[PDB]
Structures are given as structure tokens and as C-alpha cells.
Amino acid sequence: PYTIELIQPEDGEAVIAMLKTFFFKDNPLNTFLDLGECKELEKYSLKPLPDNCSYKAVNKKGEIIGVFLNGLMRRPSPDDVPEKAADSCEHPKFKKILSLMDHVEEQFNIFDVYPDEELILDGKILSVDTNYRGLGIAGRLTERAYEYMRENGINVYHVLCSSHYSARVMEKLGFHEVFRMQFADYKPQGEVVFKPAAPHVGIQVMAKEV
Numbered sequence: 001p002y003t004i005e006l007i008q009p010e011d012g013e014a015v016i017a018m019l020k021t022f023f024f025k026d027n028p029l030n031t032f033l034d035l036g037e038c039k040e041l042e043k044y045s046l047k048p049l050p051d052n053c054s055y056k057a058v059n060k061k062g063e064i065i066g067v068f069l070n071g072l073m074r075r076p077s078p079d080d081v082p083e084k085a086a087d088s089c090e091h092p093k094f095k096k097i098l099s100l101m102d103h104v105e106e107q108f109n110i111f112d113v114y115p116d117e118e119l120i121l122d123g124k125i126l127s128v129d130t131n132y133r134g135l136g137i138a139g140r141l142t143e144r145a146y147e148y149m150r151e152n153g154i155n156v157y158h159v160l161c162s163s164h165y166s167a168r169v170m171e172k173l174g175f176h177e178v179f180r181m182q183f184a185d186y187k188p189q190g191e192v193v194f195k196p197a198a199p200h201v202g203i204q205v206m207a208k209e210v
């Protein structure tokens with residue numbers, strides 16, 4: 001028995017404690033790189049909270065057993081020159097992840113798919129405690145975001161998935177692929193950066209219109 005609740009920035013420490021236990025260790029990219037201590041990922045994870053559209057799953061004892069951290073994303077201004085997130089990162093391993101994200105954004109702009117949309121919901125970090133996996137918590141976290149979307153006239157939910165494993169969960173929830181890139185094809189300086197196990201395949205950007 002669990003609740004799905006809005007995350008408050010005062011929940012930050014508890015959210016980070018949970019992420020350090022699971023996501024930091026078991027996201028396919030993190031575990032491949034052996035991420036270790038990563039204050040930059042902590043910073044990254046806390047950033048979307050004040051947008052007031054991130055959700056926690058909480059068990060009967062009051063412990064966080066899942067999160068979906070979401071932020072609002074706005075269409076680039078006409079005069080915008082994009083910034084690389086990787087430029088402001090000192091952590092070498094996390095910088096590789098940010099560089100991959102920058103590369104995806106350089107190759108694919110979600111706002112090109114949806115020319116009429118000014119604001120899109122961006123699902124940034126999804127993580128469920130191992131002992132509570134396979135119970136539909138990911139879906140219930142996602143469903144709470146649909147409520148926020150309805151309340152605010154947002155039509156598109158965008159989620160970058162770092163493995164085919166997680167893309168499949170989003171597919172079950174009614175998302176569809178809008179962009180993909182195999183890890184084997186990601187060669188920013190001529191050589192492969194990421195080679196997790198074969199079933200992960202690569203990144204998939206998933207979208208749903210609600």
C-alpha cells in the first residue's frame with residue numbers, strides 16, 4: 001500500500017538518499033561507468049524539484065520507494081544558441097553522460113516534432129526501490145504527471161530513456177519512440193564511449209500526448 005505525492009524541495013535529502021541507493025548504482029549508464037560519489041548528479045536531480053511537478057511513491061511507513069523527477073521544458077527562443085550541459089561539469093564520468101545528452105539534443109529537438117507546443121513536460125529521473133519493482137509504481141508515478149499536465153494545458157510528456165529496458169516500460173504506459181541512437185553508433189571522437197550489455201542497445205527518446 002503506497003501513496004503518490006508531490007515532492008517538495010524540503011524532501012531533497014530524502015530523494016537524494018533514495019537515488020544514491022538505487023539509481024546511482026543501477027541506472028544502466030551509471031553502473032556501466034561505475035559512477036561512485038557524484039555531487040553533480042545530486043545537483044542535477046535536485047534542479048527540477050521547484051517546478052512543482054515531481055512525484056514520490058511512499059510506502060505505509062513513510063519511506064520513499066520511488067520517484068519520477070520532472071521539469072518543464074520551454075521551446076528555445078528564436079535567438080537561442082544552445083549551451084552544452086557538459087561544459088559546466090567537473091566530474092569526468094558524469095560529464096560523459098551529460099555529453100551524450102548534449103549530443104542527443106544536437107541531433108534531435110523534441111520541439112521540431114511538436115511545432116505548436118511552447119511547454120513540454122520532461123521526465124528526467126525515474127527510479128523505483130528494487131523490492132517494489134514490477135508492481136506498477138512507474139505507471140502510477142507517470143499517471144500523476146498526467147494530472148499536472150491536464151491542470152496546466154500541457155499536451156506532451158517527453159522522456160529520454162537510457163536503455164531499451166526502460167523504453168519498454170514507457171511503451172507499456174503508452175509512450176512511443178521519437179528518436180533513437182545505438183551506443184555502438186555513439187562515437188563523438190571516432191570511438192565508442194558506452195558499451196553496456198547488448199540488451200540495452202542504446203538511448204530512446206519516448207513521448208506521449210495526453
Ligand SMILES: CC(C)(COP(=O)(O)OP(=O)(O)OC[C@H]1O[C@@H](n2cnc3c(N)ncnc32)[C@H](O)[C@@H]1OP(=O)(O)O)[C@@H](O)C(=O)NCCC(=O)NCCS
Pocket residue numbers: 022023026027028125126127128129130132133134135136137138139160161162166167169172
Ligand atoms: C525502470 C523502473 C523505474 C521500472 O519501475 P517499475 O515500477 O518496476 O515498473 P513496472 O512495474 O511497470 O515493471 C516493469 C517491468 O519490470 C519487470 N519486472 C517484473 N518484476 C520485476 C522485479 N521484481 N524487478 C525488476 N523488474 C521486474 C517486468 O518486465 C515489468 O514489466 P511488466 O510488469 O509489464 O511485465 C525500475 O526498473 C528502475 O528503477 N530501474 C533502474 C533505474 C533506471 O534505469 N531509471 C530510468 C528509467 S527511464
Ligand SMILES: CC(=O)NCCc1ccccc1
Pocket residue numbers: 027029030097123124125126127159160161162
Ligand atoms: C527517465 C530517466 O530516468 N532517464 C535517465 C537518464 C539519466 C540521467 C542521469 C544519469 C543517467 C541516466
